[PDB]
């Protein structure tokens with residue numbers, strides 16, 4: 001099919017996604033892997049994972065737009081703290097781009113957001129999820145204080161994900177920050193490159209923790225290797241869950257196996273996202289609209305490196321059967337600040353719509 005705005009696409013139903021991508025980019029992402037993009041990527045997961053094989057369909061419909069369609073329910077659960085921003089940013093698009101279901105909007109918006117992150121894959125995007133569902137129940141969203149056993153069981157119950165797929169999906173923490181874990185600081189990044197979809201998070205979680213970016217007393221947080229902040233450039237935060245996954249015998253080898261393996265990480269993330277994005281649906285009933293996902297920004301191709309103030313002596317290794325790679329260390333004796341903005345600065349307020357969540 002040829003769209004009215006002269007693009008040839010695979011299927012006529014794909015056409016409406018072209019102006020949607022343009023609108024998302026102009027309005028909330030600005031072609032950046034920044035705050036609003038990150039919040040939308042997080043929403044793809046919180047929307048999709050709220051499904052349970054054991055509890056049955058009444059517990060939730062998976063990748064179904066429930067967060068948008070019932071904005072006063074799940075966003076107010078404690079495990080969904082902070083999801084309101086992404087929900088309130090996407091509702092105006094649901095209202096305007098009113099041939100595309102809420103469910104499809106969430107998954108597509110995440111694919112568009114990710115495409116702005118250098119190194120990210122071009123996600124598969126299937127379309128045709130219905131615009132009617134139910135609100136999910138509480139307890140379906142993993143929390144950072146949870147054990148590895150609890151996390152792996154949650155993902156197995158949601159969609160049969162293997163531990164390999166779970167760790168693969170945590171490549172998203174390469175482009176991720178925390179606003180609610182510590183009430184005293186905002187935008188605390190999980191790696192030193194929160195605007196780049198690289199392997200730094202896998203490396204940096206394996207370093208010895210030396211302090212905290214804010215207070216020392218927060219649920220779900222453990223000591224960070226890069227805690228220095230100044231102004232709006234908040235220090236790195238480490239989640240208890242990521243730490244636990246990096247060291248648990250079930251997942252340690254998988255965790256380590258992504259260090260300095262960018263193409264493998266990106267391909268693995270793409271494969272697990274293909275499964276996540278269709279939870280609650282039979283993929284044989286969704287049309288392939290992958291050609292309307294924007295082409296992602298390329299990586300520079302550089303290897304992973306130890307940040308200044310760290311090195312191999314700081315590693316806490318847990319995989320007996322795989323050799324840890326030889327990596328360089330960035331020069332300097334003290335830690336560099338992790339910039340608050342993609343252009344290196346301190347200030348870059350994003351667009352935020354008011355709304356019902």
Ligand code: HEM
Pocket residue numbers: 035038039041042045081082142143144145151169170172173175176177178179180181182239241
């Ligand atoms: C065991 C599983 C996981 C746990 C416990 C977890 C936990 C968290 C927590 C606590 C935050 C910080 C929220 C805040 O305080 O503002 C966060 C942020 C984030 N998470 Fe995860 N997460 C998990 C899996 C995932 C997966 C599977 C994805 C997506 C594929 C994802 C994508 C993100 C993104 C992109 C952010 C950053 C949001 C922003 O920077 O504004 N997470 N996660």
Ligand SMILES: *[C@@H]1O[C@H](CO)[C@@H](O[C@@H]2O[C@H](CO)[C@@H](O)[C@H](O)[C@H]2NC(C)=O)[C@H](O)[C@H]1NC(C)=O
Pocket residue numbers: 069094095096098099100101102131
């Ligand atoms: C999916 O459902 C939503 C929510 O019912 C629909 O949203 C409404 O969209 C119309 C325009 O079509 C607006 O006048 C309303 O204000 C929206 N409602 C709410 C509660 O925001 C949406 O149109 C539906 N989309 C599809 C593809 O059927």
Ligand SMILES: *[C@H]1O[C@H](CO)[C@@H](O)[C@H](O)[C@@H]1O
Pocket residue numbers: 308330331332333334335336337
């Ligand atoms: C980032 O900044 C630190 C100092 O904060 C340096 O040691 C490093 O070399 C880089 O310039």
Ligand SMILES: [Ca+2]
Pocket residue numbers: 046047048049050060061062063064065066067136
């Ligand atoms: Ca949902």
Ligand SMILES: [Ca+2]
Pocket residue numbers: 173174175191192193194195196197198199200201
């Ligand atoms: Ca990164």
Ligand SMILES: [Mn+2]
Pocket residue numbers: 035038039177178179187
């Ligand atoms: Mn945030």
